[PDB]
Amino acid sequence: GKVALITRGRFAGKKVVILQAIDQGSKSHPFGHAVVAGVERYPLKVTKSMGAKRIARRSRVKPFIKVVNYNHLMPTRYALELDNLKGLITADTFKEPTQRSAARKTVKKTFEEKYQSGKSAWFFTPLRF
């Protein structure tokens, strides 16, 4: 549930939330790994003048679930927890891309609900650099 940022790889400068920690070590990742789901495409600044389809398109966000090491991650004071974000992270979802795709779809749906509710605004807004 702790908000984390990725400073390495393609998803550089992307905020993520630790759905399941693998810091205890794993055969796949012999390091302080952590399978987390973050936001790659932050929702655009939706304007009330825009249409309902226009608002949803701007508010659409692309999530991303990946496993990264603790060194590659960066802890943050802020933290967000979701009921649907607990228990849905497992090796089976990572192993099965269809399970991963459904996991990505569910995570985006939860994030879209969070963005629609106005929660996690700092996480929802992309960070500058």
């Binding site: 089976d92 099965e96 269809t98 399970q99 795709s101």
Partner: protein, 98 residues
């Protein structure tokens, strides 16, 4: 291998990730299993003639398979004698499409 390094044909039947594909060692048929719970069965005749390209067309689309945790058909096996497909699901149920 005799046509090109690029695939001779492409298919995207599965609504989910294409888990595995199996071609019968004897029967001129191929099967593809995916996590979508739908298994596609195709009949393909391959001729040794240079001008005779492989004619592969779909034959059936198996359905009515339970999907658990976004996982459907996982392992598909073809019978050594006839065109019978043994598909094992995520629920421990094995369907033998004779």
């Amino acid at each position: 291998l005799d046509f090109s390094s690029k695939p001779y044909k492409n298919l995207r039947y599965h609504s989910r990730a294409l888990r595995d594909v199996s071609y019968h060692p004897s029967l001129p048929l191929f099967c593809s299993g995916s996590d979508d719970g739908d298994v596609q069965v195709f009949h393909g005749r391959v001729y040794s003639d240079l001008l005779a390209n492989p004619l592969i067309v779909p034959l059936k689309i198996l359905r009515n398979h339970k999907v658990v945790d976004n996982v459907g058909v996982l392992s598909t096996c073809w019978h050594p004698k006839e065109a019978w497909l043994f598909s094992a699901g995520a629920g421990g149920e094995i369907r033998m499409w004779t």
